[PDB]
Write an enzyme that holds these catalytic residues in place. Structure first.
Site, PDB file in Angstrom:
ATOM      1  N   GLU A 116      83.974  51.164  85.384  1.00 30.06           N
ATOM      2  CA  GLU A 116      85.127  50.282  85.226  1.00 30.06           C
ATOM      3  C   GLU A 116      86.384  51.114  85.133  1.00 30.06           C
ATOM      4  OE1 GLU A 116      85.748  47.198  85.610  1.00 30.06           O
ATOM      5  OE2 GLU A 116      83.737  46.388  85.614  1.00 30.06           O
ATOM      6  N   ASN A 119      95.751  42.829  90.245  1.00 27.37           N
ATOM      7  CA  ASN A 119      94.948  42.038  91.172  1.00 27.37           C
ATOM      8  C   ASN A 119      95.831  41.110  91.995  1.00 27.37           C
ATOM      9  OD1 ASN A 119      93.039  42.116  88.304  1.00 27.37           O
ATOM     10  ND2 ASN A 119      92.026  42.726  90.212  1.00 27.37           N
ATOM     11  N   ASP A 164      95.851  37.881  92.167  1.00 26.25           N
ATOM     12  CA  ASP A 164      96.270  36.661  91.457  1.00 26.25           C
ATOM     13  C   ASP A 164      97.357  36.886  90.386  1.00 26.25           C
ATOM     14  OD1 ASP A 164      94.889  37.946  89.417  1.00 26.25           O
ATOM     15  OD2 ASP A 164      93.537  36.264  88.995  1.00 26.25           O
ATOM     16  N   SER A 181      97.082  38.867  87.827  1.00 30.96           N
ATOM     17  CA  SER A 181      96.538  39.402  86.582  1.00 30.96           C
ATOM     18  C   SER A 181      96.380  40.923  86.656  1.00 30.96           C
ATOM     19  CB  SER A 181      95.181  38.766  86.300  1.00 30.96           C
ATOM     20  OG  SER A 181      94.194  39.200  87.218  1.00 30.96           O
ATOM     21  N   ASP A 197      93.934  44.266  84.891  1.00 29.60           N
ATOM     22  CA  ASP A 197      92.766  44.645  84.125  1.00 29.60           C
ATOM     23  C   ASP A 197      93.211  45.768  83.200  1.00 29.60           C
ATOM     24  OD1 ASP A 197      91.288  42.837  85.536  1.00 29.60           O
ATOM     25  OD2 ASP A 197      90.928  44.228  87.143  1.00 29.60           O
ATOM     26  N   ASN A 243      90.656  41.553  81.820  1.00 30.54           N
ATOM     27  CA  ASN A 243      91.612  40.788  82.574  1.00 30.54           C
ATOM     28  C   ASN A 243      92.578  39.897  81.791  1.00 30.54           C
ATOM     29  OD1 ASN A 243      92.074  38.200  84.443  1.00 30.54           O
ATOM     30  ND2 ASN A 243      91.870  39.991  85.733  1.00 30.54           N
TER      31      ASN A 243
END
EC number: 3.2.1.17
Length: 129
Positions: A35, A46, A48, A50, A52, A59
């Site tokens: 990760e 990302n 959209d 958002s 991480d 998220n």
């Protein structure tokens, strides 16, 4: 902070992740490796809107609030910046809420793609836990 493999394993154990919800410690160390590569400060944007955050790449759309994500639910009730700390406590507390959500560790795509079904115990071998 960049954690070394065994140092992280020790810390996650002390925070109660070993066998939490049916997942042995190795799953958690493996998820952190793919990760964020053990980095507390990793972030990723990302499509959209958002982002991480941190060692477990949590998220901003469902879990933490960063103030700039359209559709934010903040289900862990925590600012996203608290997850970039060198202290993994806030990330572990929120990860515990995410995994109790009914889909287990499938919440983490890298875990899904690279850890599930492998000898995850490899991640803790050689460590004094």
């Amino acid at each position: 902070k960049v954690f070394g493999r065994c140092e992280l394993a020790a810390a996650m154990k002390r925070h109660g992740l070993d066998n939490y919800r049916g997942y042995s410690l190795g799953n958690w160390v493996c998820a952190a490796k793919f990760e964020s590569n053990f980095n507390t400060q990793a972030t990723n944007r990302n499509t959209d809107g958002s982002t991480d955050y941190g060692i477990l790449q949590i998220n901003s759309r469902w879990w933490c609030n960063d103030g700039r994500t359209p559709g934010s639910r903040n289900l862990c009730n925590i600012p996203c910046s608290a997850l970039l700390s060198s202290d993994i406590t806030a990330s572990v507390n929120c990860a515990k809420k995410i995994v109790s959500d009914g889909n287990g560790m499938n919440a983490w795509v890298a875990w899904r793609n690279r850890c599930k079904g492998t000898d995850v115990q490899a991640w803790i071998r050689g460590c004094r836990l």
